[PDB]
Structures are given as structure tokens and as C-alpha cells.
């Protein structure tokens, strides 16, 4: 099976707060101690949205059994069905351009943001401190597509471009409701790294 690669960049529009490692720290690597966006987060978020775009009954929701075509795209192999995932998402890593830019403009990588709660009929505040990835930083990603069959590749990338649009107008991370987590996508590149398939007519916005 040929494998078609997707590479690009996540631009951090407003703050981003994964914080799986937690005052309330964010997820960080340990070889560079610079933050990352775990791939599990991206995959879960896209799966949730793209499922919601298609049908979703309380029964589909009951046991994470989802619409057949999203299932095909992301793999279930649970209901006695042969479905390994067809789309692989990797992690995103603090990019080099970002590091150089923030070094030569003397700006930190993380903002420490203080939050309060005002109690009802009490008017007393209990403070909170939330640490978030600074804006305007860029992370780079790579995806891998496997072509288990030839005659669903165009349709599957139509689904993926719909999903990327939905992400471009949604939040990834913690508490987008409370403010942080909008992202954008730039510099999409499509190559067939191994195989004999053409990557010229295929596009993602």
C-alpha cells in the first residue's frame, strides 16, 4: 500500500492549554523542555467533530460506535470488523523558527494567567493560576495516509479537508469556552512518500 504524507504547521491564535502534566503546568517534552501538542489530542478532537458532522444517535454515543465512514477513516476493529486506522497523526513540536523568533525578540514561551471565581451572594474571590502556551507560536505536524484501497482516497481527503476547516473554526486544548485554543493551519504539503500514487490533484485547505 502506498503512503501519502501530510505536513504543515499549527499557528497558535490565542492561548493553548493542554496541561496533561498537571502551579497547573502544561504538557512539555523532556529532551528540550519545550511544550508540545500531543497527537492524541488532535486525533480525538478531529474524531469528535467529524463524527458530529455526520449522524449521531444516543446509541452511537452509548458505546463509541460511530458512523461507518468516519469509522473507516479512523478505525474501530471492535464490532467483529476488520478496521485498522487509515490516518496517522503524530505529535507537534515547538518549531525552530519560533525558537529563533522569540529569542531575537525576547519573549517568553508561556504565559501565567490568573483567574478568579466570584461566589454567589458571597462576592468573595477564590483565585486560580493557569499557564498557557503563548500566542503566535507555531508547531509543525506530519500525518500519514495509507491507501488500503484505491477508490476511497479522494472521498477520504474530502472528509479530511472538511475536518480541518472545522478545526480552523474550533478550539483545541483546555477550556476554549473560557478563552484559549483557537488554531489555524498553514503550509499544507502533500507527497506520496512510498508507492506509485500521484499527489498533484489532491488538496487540503
Amino acid at each position: 500500500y502506498s503512503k501519502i504524507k501530510i505536513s504543515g504547521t499549527i499557528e497558535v491564535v490565542t492561548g493553548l492549554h493542554i496541561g496533561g502534566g498537571g502551579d497547573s503546568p502544561v504538557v512539555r517534552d523532556l529532551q528540550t523542555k519545550l511544550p508540545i501538542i500531543p497527537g492524541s489530542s488532535i486525533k480525538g478532537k478531529m474524531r469528535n467533530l467529524l463524527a458530529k458532522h455526520f449522524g449521531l444517535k444516543m446509541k452511537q454515543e452509548s458505546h463509541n460506535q460511530d458512523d461507518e465512514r468516519v469509522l473507516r477513516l479512523f478505525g474501530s476493529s471492535e464490532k467483529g470488523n476488520i478496521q485498522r486506522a487509515r490516518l496517522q497523526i503524530s505529535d507537534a513540536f515547538f518549531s525552530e523558527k519560533t525558537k529563533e523568533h522569540f529569542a531575537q525578540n525576547d519573549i517568553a514561551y508561556t504565559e501565567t494567567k490568573f483567574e478568579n471565581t466570584i461566589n454567589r451572594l458571597t462576592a468573595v474571590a477564590n483565585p486560580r493560576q493557569i499557564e498557557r502556551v503563548t500566542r503566535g507560536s507555531e508547531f509543525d505536524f506530519v500525518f500519514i495516509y495509507n491507501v488500503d484501497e484505491e477508490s476511497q482516497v479522494e472521498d477520504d481527503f474530502e472528509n479530511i479537508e472538511k475536518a480541518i476547516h472545522l478545526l480552523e473554526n474550533d478550539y483545541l486544548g483546555g477550556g476554549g469556552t473560557r478563552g484559549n485554543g483557537r488554531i489555524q493551519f498553514k503550509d499544507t504539503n502533500i507527497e506520496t512518500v512510498v508507492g506509485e500514487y500521484d499527489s498533484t490533484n489532491l488538496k487540503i485547505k
Binding site: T32, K33, L34, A103, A108
Partner: protein
């Protein structure tokens, strides 16, 4: 080393800590030290760049500002030899010594936090 250990027990008087030092009073210093920590960690070589030297200079300026702002912080910095240590760190221009200073100061803060009102 851990002179921090026995110093922190030397500064328990009658109870006040360094004449009333509290953890809220070192937040800015902790933030600045943490940022210098991550920047220096990002660096590859042991030789400190002149920009990081200027960062150390501004860090010294900030210790002096905070020590002028409050008296207890002044006594803490004075007895813990923060100023002589920073001067020696600036003289040495070695990254490993700066990280060792980071560990020392973290120990100081941790002790100060564990002994509180």
C-alpha cells in the same frame, strides 16, 4: 552543600521567618529565575552568550530592586549571599554553575515554603 538547609533552620526566631518573609514576596524572582533557566537550557554550548550575560545583569538589577522594596527580602538576600553568588556567577560565565545556582535557590525557596505560618 545544602547550606540552605541549616540556614533555614538558623532563621527560625521568636514566630517570624526572616522577620516575616512569605512565599508571596518572591514570586517575581521565581518567575525571572525560571525563565532564565529555560533559556539557558535551550542553549547548547557552555560559554554564556553576551545576551545571556545581559540577562544575568538584569537579574541582578531585579534582586536589588526587590531588596530595596522590602526589608525582609533584603535580610534574606543579604544572609543567603545571593548577591555574592550572583556576582561570582557573572564572573565565571559558565552555564553549569548557573544551573547549580538554580538548584540552590530552588532549595532555598522550597525550605522557606515548607516552614510557613
Amino acid at each position: 552543600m545544602t547550606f540552605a538547609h541549616e540556614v533555614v533552620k538558623s532563621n527560625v526566631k521568636n514566630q517570624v521567618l526572616f522577620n516575616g518573609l512569605t512565599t508571596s514576596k518572591l514570586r517575581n524572582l521565581m518567575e525571572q529565575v525560571n525563565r532564565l533557566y529555560t533559556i539557558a537550557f535551550n542553549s547548547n554550548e557552555d560559554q554564556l552568550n553576551e545576551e545571556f550575560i545581559d540577562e544575568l545583569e538584569y537579574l541582578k538589577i531585579k534582586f536589588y530592586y526587590e531588596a530595596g522594596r522590602e526589608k525582609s527580602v533584603d535580610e534574606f538576600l543579604k544572609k543567603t549571599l545571593m548577591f555574592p553568588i550572583i556576582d561570582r556567577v557573572i564572573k565565571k560565565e559558565s552555564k553549569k554553575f548557573f544551573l547549580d545556582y538554580c538548584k540552590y535557590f530552588e532549595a532555598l525557596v522550597a525550605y522557606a515554603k515548607y516552614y510557613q505560618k
